[PDB]
Chain A
């Protein structure tokens, strides 16, 4: 349904006249295609039947209940992202018309969802390399979709080079595996899981570690995320980790058969180093996207401890964490795409150049959001409080579940560092909350009419004029209450994760 509709959108888009209304309407055709895909997927795919694991397409693709969880999650998060490009994020024509200037935006996104959803299912080194390129090529194109922008093109060039080296490392590990065994199917390799150099699978992981931005490779991800348009950074900083971390978990599932300790020490060396950089790095930053880039690295460090431990509680910790972290990430970026309407306008010093690609770029552009919109400020406060790990939000249960998996497997050193690194990172999450509210009472009664939102035309002066569009507001509210009120249905959700199996059985 995804592939067939993609061809129809490719042909149709190249026929009709270049205009914003038609570009925005085609973006609403893709929102249907992704919705239709989820209905067909959930219809045939069930947890109860995919438990054993089912080979598809001459064993090239293997699907089980652990992979199947993430495909539905990926489809869901791709619906919430397409809602941004398909509806108004602000309603001001100047800021919004950027999302509709490109007709191939939705096509490239639909290309990536095919790439993302097939990566966890791969079961052959021949198709592992092909699928990882299909996902990797789609990201470079999306990073350069705004080809007029100098920073966007400079980022895609940086992205392509780093990913090309990353893909070469992945390709070289598979070749080395084929050299030793002569087999391509992953199941056939499992028969020789004790007879092959287990470090050649680690060389495979080193390639997948680059693509998720893990230190010492973290440098490029921070640069890329702080240069792309905020609508682009909202996608490329979350989606690759959804499908690669699922793949990394499976590869580590096979690896722990021989339980090689040297493999675990090197990965612990990278997890430990990344927590240090992910925490101390964000202390001295001014750009919000650079801040969320360091925040992303720290959460990936937590999620690797659940992957590295790889027990029965590690499935629960990973499955829960990857879901709550995606909703938190969408909620935060959606707010940053909206609160740009409250920016002031000059009528000077420090010569800060703002562009239509990142209207909100600095942390102090969040100033006085407690005054301009109190309800959305709390939503950003609740979201940041989840990242801090304050209970009983979603973020606490992610760290609590990760700690169970980590300590149950003897990772005492990493468990303590993650709890040190969490507190160090609380400093720079607290700065976002300091900027949001702390200067409320001095600014309470101010004469503000130079905001960007004050350039909106007055329609009637009799009817009520809401400040924020309908769809984006409903998404922000829904994900803010889900983050806040997870305590109500937490027991059902966690018991719904006990059933996700990866060859546990009995």
Chain B
């Protein structure tokens, strides 16, 4: 089903909706790592997952900062 690229129908029509899809996409990677690590009883996989959660947070903050300044750049008359 997803070979027809169904996930494109599931992503909204705003720049903020793309940002969320990136997080939900990466969330799948971390859940996959936690799954393998627990079955193998391997904590190295859990170190990887902890890094992925922390790195996925820094990516969100930078992306939102760019989006925020993108928004105020239009609303930059400020001649009052």
Q: Do chains A and B touch in the complex (CB under 8 A)?
A: yes
Q: Are B69 and A147 in contact (CB under 8 A)?
A: yes
Q: Are A168 and B22 closer than 8 Å at their CB atoms? A: yes
Q: In angstroms, how far is the closest chain B Cβ from the Cβ of A138?
A: 10
Is residue A195 contacting chain B, with contact meaning CB distance below 8 A? no
A-B contact count (CB 8 A): 77
User: Which residues of B are found within 8 Å of A175, using beta-carbon distances?
Assistant: 29, 32-33, 36, 48
* CB < 8 Å neighbour of B70 from A130, A140, A141, A157: A157
Min C-beta distance of B36 to chain A, whole Å: 5
State the CA gap A140–B22 with chains docked (Å).
16
Q: Is the CB of A126 within 8 A of B48?
A: yes
A264 on interface, CB distance cutoff 8 Å: no
Provide the bound-state CA to CA distance between A257 and B43, in Å.
30
Residues of A contacting B66 in the complex (Cβ-Cβ under 8 angstroms):
140, 144, 153, 156-157, 160
Cross-chain contact B69 with A144 (CB below 8 angstroms) = yes
Q: In the bound complex, what is the Cα–Cα distance between A161 and B60 (angstroms)?
A: 11
Closest to B74 in A: A150
- In B6-57, the 8 Å CB interface with A consists of 15, 18-19, 22, 25-26, 28-29, 32-33, 36, 40, 42, 44-45, 47-48, 51-52, 55
On chain A, the residues within 8 Å of B63 by CB distance are 160-161, 164
CB distance from A331 to the nearest CB of B (A): 32
Query: Out of A129, A141, A161, which one reaches B51, CB within 8 Å?
Result: A129
B73 with A150: CB separation less than 8 A: yes
- Cβ-based interface call for A165 (8 A): yes
What total of chain A residues lie within 8 Å of the partner, measured CB to CB?
30
CB distance from B73 to the nearest CB of A (A): 6
Question: Is A217 part of the binding interface, using a Cβ–Cβ cutoff of 8 Å?
Answer: no
Report the Cα distance A156→B64, complex, angstroms.
11
Contact status A164-B59, CB under 8 Å: yes
Give bound CA distance, A175 to B28, whole Å.
10
Shortest CB distance B19–A (Å): 8
Pairwise interchain contact A178-B33, C-beta atoms closer than 8 A:
yes
Query: Is there an interface contact between A164 and B15, defined as CB atoms closer than 8 Å?
Result: no
- Closest CB in chain A relative to B74 CB, distance in Å: 8
Contact of B62 among A141, A154, A168, A182 (CB under 8 A): A141
Cβ of B3 within 8 Å of any chain A Cβ, yes or no, is: no
Which residue of B32, B42, B51, B58 contacts A137 across the interface (Cβ within 8 Å)? B58
Are A161's CB and B59's CB within 8 A? no
Separation in Å of the A417 CB from the closest CB of chain B?
30
With A and B bound together, what is the CA distance between A171 and B28 in angstroms?
Answer: 10
Give Cα A178 to B62, complex, Å.
Answer: 28
What residue of chain B has the Cβ atom nearest to residue A163's Cβ? B59
Tell me the complex Cα distance, A126–B45, Å.
Answer: 9
A5 to B15, CA, bound (A): 38
Given contact pairs A144-B66, A157-B67, A157-B70, A133 touches B59 in the complex (Cβ within 8 A) = yes
**How many Å lie between the Cα of A137 and that of B40 in the bound state?**
33
Known pairs A129-B52, A161-B22; A167 contacts B59 (CB<8 A) = yes
Q: In the docked arrangement, what's the CA distance between A435 and B44, Å? A: 60
A268 proximal to B (CB < 8 A): no
Least CB separation from A185: chain B residue: B44
Q: Give the distance in Å from the alpha carbon of A153 to the alpha carbon of B72 in the complex.
A: 11
Q: Tell yes or no: A463 within 8 A of B by CB.
A: no
Q: How far is the CB of A219 from chain B (nearest CB, A)?
A: 16
27 interchain pairs, CB-CB under 8 A: A125-B48, A126-B48, A129-B55, A130-B51, A133-B58, A133-B59, A137-B58, A140-B62, A147-B73, A148-B73, A153-B66, A153-B73, A156-B66, A157-B66, A157-B67, A164-B59, A164-B63, A165-B22, A168-B22, A171-B29, A172-B28, A175-B29, A176-B32, A178-B48, A179-B33, A184-B44, A184-B48
Chain B residues with CB under 8 Å of chain A are: 15, 18-19, 22, 25-26, 28-29, 32-33, 36, 40, 42, 44-45, 47-48, 51-52, 55, 58-59, 62-63, 66-67, 69-70, 73
Given A154-B70, A156-B66, A165-B25, 12 more pairs with CB closer than 8 A? A126-B44, A133-B59, A137-B59, A137-B62, A148-B73, A157-B15, A160-B66, A168-B22, A168-B26, A171-B29, A175-B29, A182-B40
